[PDB]
Design a protein around this ligand. Sequence first.
Ligand SMILES: Nc1ncnc2c1ncn2[C@@H]1O[C@H](COP(=O)(O)OP2(=O)OP(=O)(O)OP(=O)(O)OP(=O)(O)O2)[C@@H](O)[C@H]1O
Length: 124
Amino acid sequence: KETAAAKFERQHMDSSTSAASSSNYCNQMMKSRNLTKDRCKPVNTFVHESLADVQAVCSQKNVACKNGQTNCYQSYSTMSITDCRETGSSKYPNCAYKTTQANKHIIVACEGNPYVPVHFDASV
Ligand SMILES: Nc1ncnc2c1ncn2[C@@H]1O[C@H](COP(=O)(O)OP2(=O)OP(=O)(O)OP(=O)(O)OP(=O)(O)O2)[C@@H](O)[C@H]1O
């Protein structure tokens, strides 16, 4: 199957652009990464840093996860991210998103051996 680490890469990694490509970015990316096939995923974040930089977060600041588990980590540096949020116009499967660029610390949940990101928890 798709591993949880690979699913994190598909849902959350976009190292090829420095920032949010355009006002079209989320519309295109939510579709191309398969986040609109079963339903419009309501919110989702993409990180514009190298895979190694995001993986390194699993050894950075340990913080509680929103679900109460203890395996979340906050990046020491700010990272370039793009938040995608479903609009009102949006009706599946013509899912429509607002694209917002930001520079924030990311919080990811990590699991496994090797210990790698498997869930995007928050940005702060
Ligand atoms: N401390 C944790 N460690 C490992 N996994 C966790 C943890 N805390 C929540 N999780 C997972 O977070 C899911 C949220 O279920 P949800 O309905 O939101 O679909 P998701 O696609 O959307 P999310 O944006 O939250 O998240 P993600 O896009 O990244 O993808 P994930 O596959 O993680 O979830 C839960 O089921 C768990 O597997």
